[PDB]
Design a protein around this ligand. Structure first.
Ligand SMILES: CCCCCCCCCCCC(=O)OP(=O)(O)OC[C@H]1O[C@@H](n2cnc3c(N)ncnc32)[C@H](O)[C@@H]1O
Length: 566
């Protein structure tokens, strides 16, 4: 548990200063690049932060100013994040754009947040420019540690905004969640406590470090709690899922996790023979959150790795979202997570229709107990639902964020939930679910998810990615779309292939390359890939798309790949 002197700090900045004073040589973060290891102690993080803050100050940045960070995974960008905080500037972490000229998302973020400076690694100054989208750019490599002594401390307030975190999927009109210093520490504390962390905790992570779980859970929480973080890049996991498990083994990581898909992805790609040497016994919490959590995924993963020390006990479903900083519900670590079986037909008043383990039934996994206050509320009447009745998940706590940057009206729709009639104020999540036995079961979204993929232009942009990647040389036309399938949504990609007789080796190689490309460009996961003969698609990307959708439902297929199927 955190010592009192750390609990008493009013910002993450003061926490880091204090750990740098009291345990300067304690190792904090380790970043892995292939076989290479780079490490950073509290003393080093603190010194780099000061040097970085000093530079921002010398360049004319004032408290409250936004500073953009091209978040290449690594220690430098972590240093940059703290450096912003040390200067009282609002950090704005973004995924560095996958392709040099595909900058639209970054541009929208730049226009929204209006940063005065952007920080990035030397390799990116090259790729991207000095100015980046009209914003003056500074290479992190150029900030000399000598500058540290010139840092002038600011007077940070609890309610001051520490950083913006842009939601995962509002790409056409990005929402920058405003996370205050008080928000951040409240959620870090709930994470450290709820996950039963201690002095010996070791967190391993490959997750995108610029937002939600990969930032708040896997970097800021360890730094806050005085425990080790060990990390590699998402690209590394995507290219070789096995590395996740090899690193947990070598480092004896105790806590690591991911969205649900990643457990399936290990099952799908890791062959029996390659598992030799794995020892997952140290892994006591394997958290599963950020998307719908599936029993089948976890059962599959458990049987694929139980012979290598993985315990089903370790699986930890959890629920949260950026507007609530991060963690909202979660269970007790080491406990078996619960499931419920629902009948095929549900009730129109959204009450829950349970079934015996009937023949059209389906299972929902619990995302745990409310860590933040959770109320299930009717999104139309604003009247509380009964238990075992689906309504909107409303959240209330000190972790609830301050709004969406520079968006008063959009903020009004999400952050000003009032129950009829009476008094508290709630975040409205957009999410549907029900409480049962004080466990939250998330059931879906208010917004039709097909209609939301369509709004962010995902299928269209994914088709473009495929056509503009080197994968094009072996394909014909392609189509991406979301199909709703027995209580699940699946992102489906289908491609004409030049060689209808490529072997099983080529098939698998191609499936893997397509999954990796779509994650690289969109950090989205394809659930189903369909291969078909050249010319099989009609000579509109729209009528082209709807043909693929309609005839998959009722054609010539060369091969099908399904992420969650063994
Ligand atoms: C130390 C480890 C700590 C890490 C702690 C982990 C706990 C929090 C992880 C989630 C953070 C989040 O995904 O952020 P975002 O705003 O980008 O999207 C949020 C949205 O995604 C969905 N969603 C999240 N969970 C879900 C779940 N269980 N079931 C089904 N849907 C889930 C919702 O639709 C939701 O509104």
């Amino acid at each position: 548990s955190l010592k009192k002197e750390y609990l008493q700090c009013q910002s993450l900045v003061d926490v880091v200063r204090l750990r740098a004073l009291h345990s300067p040589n304690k190792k904090s973060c380790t970043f892995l690049n292939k076989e290479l290891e780079e490490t950073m102690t509290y003393e080093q993080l603190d010194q780099h932060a000061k040097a970085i803050a000093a530079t921002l100050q010398a360049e004319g940045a004032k408290p409250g100013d936004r500073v953009l960070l091209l978040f290449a995974p690594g220690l430098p960008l972590i240093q940059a994040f703290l450096g912003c905080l040390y200067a009282g500037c609002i950090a704005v972490p973004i995924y560095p754009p996958a392709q040099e000229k595909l900058l639209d998302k970054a541009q929208r973020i730049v226009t929204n947040s209006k940063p005065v400076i952007v920080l990035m690694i030397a390799d990116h100054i090259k790729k991207f420019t000095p100015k980046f989208l009209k914003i003056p750019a500074i290479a992190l490599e150029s900030i000399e540690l000598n500058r540290s002594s010139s840092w002038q401390p600011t007077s940070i307030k609890s309610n001051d905004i520490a950083f913006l975190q842009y939601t995962s999927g509002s790409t056409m009109h990005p929402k920058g969640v405003m996370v205050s210093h008080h928000n951040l520490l409240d959620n870090l504390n709930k994470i450290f406590t709820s996950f039963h962390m201690n002095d010996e905790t070791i967190i391993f992570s490959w997750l995108p470090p610029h937002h939600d779980m990969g930032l708040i859970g896997c970097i800021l929480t360890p730094i806050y709690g005085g425990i080790q973080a060990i990390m590699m890049s998402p690209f590394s996991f995507l290219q070789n899922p096995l590395s996740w498990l090899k690193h947990i083994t070598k480092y004896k990581a105790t806590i690591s996790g991911s969205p649900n898909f990643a457990y399936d992805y290990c099952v799908k790609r890791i062959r029996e023979e390659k598992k030799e040497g794995l020892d997952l016994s140290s892994w006591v919490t394997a958290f599963n959150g950020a998307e719908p959590v599936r029993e089948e995924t976890m059962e599959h993963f458990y049987q694929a790795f139980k012979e290598f020390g993985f315990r089903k006990e370790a699986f930890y479903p959890c629920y949260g979202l950026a507007e609530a900083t991060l963690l909202v519900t979660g269970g007790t670590p080491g406990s078996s997570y619960k499931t419920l079986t629902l009948a095929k037909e549900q009730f129109q008043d959204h009450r829950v229709h349970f079934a015996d383990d009937s023949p059209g039934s389906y299972k929902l996994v619990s995302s745990g107990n409310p860590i933040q206050e959770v109320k299930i509320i009717d999104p139309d009447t604003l009247i509380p639902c009964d238990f075992d009745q689906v309504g909107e998940i409303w959240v209330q706590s000190n972790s609830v964020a301050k709004g969406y940057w520079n968006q008063p009206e959009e903020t009004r729709h999400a952050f000003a939930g009032k129950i009829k009639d009476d008094s508290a104020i709630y975040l409205r999540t957009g999410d549907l679910g029900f409480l049962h036995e004080n466990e939250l079961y998330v059931t879906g979204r208010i917004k039709d998810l097909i209609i939301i993929y369509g709004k962010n232009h995902y299928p269209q942009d994914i088709e473009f990615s495929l056509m503009h990647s080197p994968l094009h040389h072996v394909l014909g036309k392609c189509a991406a779309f979301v199909i709703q399938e027995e209580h699940e949504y699946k992102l489906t990609v289908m491609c004409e292939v030049k060689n209808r007789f490529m072997d099983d080796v080529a098939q698998d190689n191609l499936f893997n390359e397509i999954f990796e490309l779509v994650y690289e460009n969109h950090q989205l996961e394809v659930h189903t890939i369909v291969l078909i003969p050249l010319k099989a698609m009609p000579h509109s990307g729209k009528i082209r798309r709807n043909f693929c959708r309609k005839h998959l439902l009722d054609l010539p297929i060369v091969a099908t790949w399904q992420l969650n199927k063994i």
